[PDB]
Structure 1
């Protein structure tokens, strides 16, 4: 569709509350901190059906609308953490991972928007871990370095997901002080059958060791794969074998 069409669609979905956040648990694999989750965005269309990412994110990102979606995500995430904490039965979240678009890392107004949300929701910055794909960070490196350093001065943590998807040099990493490398799911799914996938997981584990970074495996779909990641020394696991995404935003 057109520019105008996609601006309306994103605006309308925001207006009708058709975006929602789920929280997927991330479990430690070694020897204890609070609950670790990653927030996942869901969009339902006007007739109530799930819209898969590939049916809206590519169009939104072409028109720079992912700034709007990220701003909604962060506000609603913070609000939900606060409202959640007012239920004394809910267990505290120690790490709440939130994905950001490349458009957001290139937006110089974002730091101010975030600073204000921290003040208003009284969130300890250290509890938030912002997450960008390796690909997006590397394609926009000058932006990512400055972005990550500004946010780190705020006190929050940082993650690269889809890590090693481009099987590239990790030299750039000397300039991004991120805390976590989250292994691309493609490598985890087939690491038991395909020795390249296994090797890539060992490599990532090794970068973690050398750079004092912690690692997370995405797409951990069986307990056998979980066990192999544990043996290698991967720090955390996420996916179908660990626990389902749960409603987070009300």
Structure 2
């Protein structure tokens, strides 16, 4: 017999094969990067550097998604806490969190630990949860979000648009790529996007647009006060080495 996907993931976790890639966040009006989104990559020993996408569902059912995320959080602290000079005060670091992680208070501890790797207030830690994940967690989010907020951690709604809004105290809305993709393709698409942006402003929330690929999209978004942009226009997820190099180039002109 052969070991299941979840068992293979466990072996990979114990051998430290899950590693962070870093996708840059840019201001809406341009300028130096203001943060990164952390992506999970698997340097598979015999199948090379990959995305564990097909494996994520298995990690969710087993629970292993939580310790996988923790291992990423620790590797980020190791990677970036020793280059905090290349990081402007306030630099955002965003993680994709799972619903399971919101049980008990482990997430508080995990964030404390990451924050301790940088000077107090030096980075802004952003935890990203989908609408679905927040609804799955509604019994715990009142207290959990209070403890995380107390530490200066922010909560973003991931893939937004993909009455419960009054059930959760969040900091940021991330506009799903599907909406950005349709900028210009038809007038309507836009109205709906305009409504999401305007809803952010009503609620005093920051806004990130995902999937920013063209200058037309960027300009449309920036004209409406979108705070932050992510997507191939700004940069693909990159290894640490490439991130530090780019950050060097940017201090270099500032």
TM (norm. structure 1) is: 0.85
Cα drift, residue 32 of structure 1: 8.4
- Structure 2 vs 1, CA of residues 200 and 145 (structure 1 numbering), >3 Å: closer, same or farther? farther
In structure 2, distance between residues paired with 1:106 and 1:231: 39
Cα drift, residue 241 of structure 1: 0.9
- Equivalent in 230, 234, 237 of residue 229 of structure 2: 237
Cα drift, residue 137 of structure 1: 0.9
**Aligned partner of residue 221 in structure 1, secondary structure:** coil
Number of corresponding residues: 240
Native 8 Å contact 1:95 1:127 kept in 2: yes
Structure 1 segment 66-145 matched on structure 2, within 5 A: 66-85=65-84, 88=85, 90-92=86-88, 94-119=91-116, 121-124=117-120, 127-145=124-142
- Structure 2 vs 1, CA of residues 243 and 118 (structure 1 numbering), >3 Å: closer, same or farther? closer
TM (norm. structure 2) is: 0.83
Greater mean deviation of Cα atoms: 232-241 or 110-119: 110-119
Structure 1 segment 142-181 matched on structure 2, within 5 A: 142-165=139-162, 171-181=163-173
Runs of 5+ consecutive residues of structure 2 not aligned to the other structure = 243-254
Aligned to 1:168: none
Cα drift, residue 237 of structure 1: 1.1
In structure 2, distance between residues paired with 1:235 and 1:197: 20
Runs of 5+ consecutive residues of structure 1 not aligned to the other structure = 166-170
Structure 1 segment 31-70 matched on structure 2, within 5 A: 35-70=34-69
- Structure 2 vs 1, CA of residues 27 and 112 (structure 1 numbering), >3 Å: closer, same or farther? closer
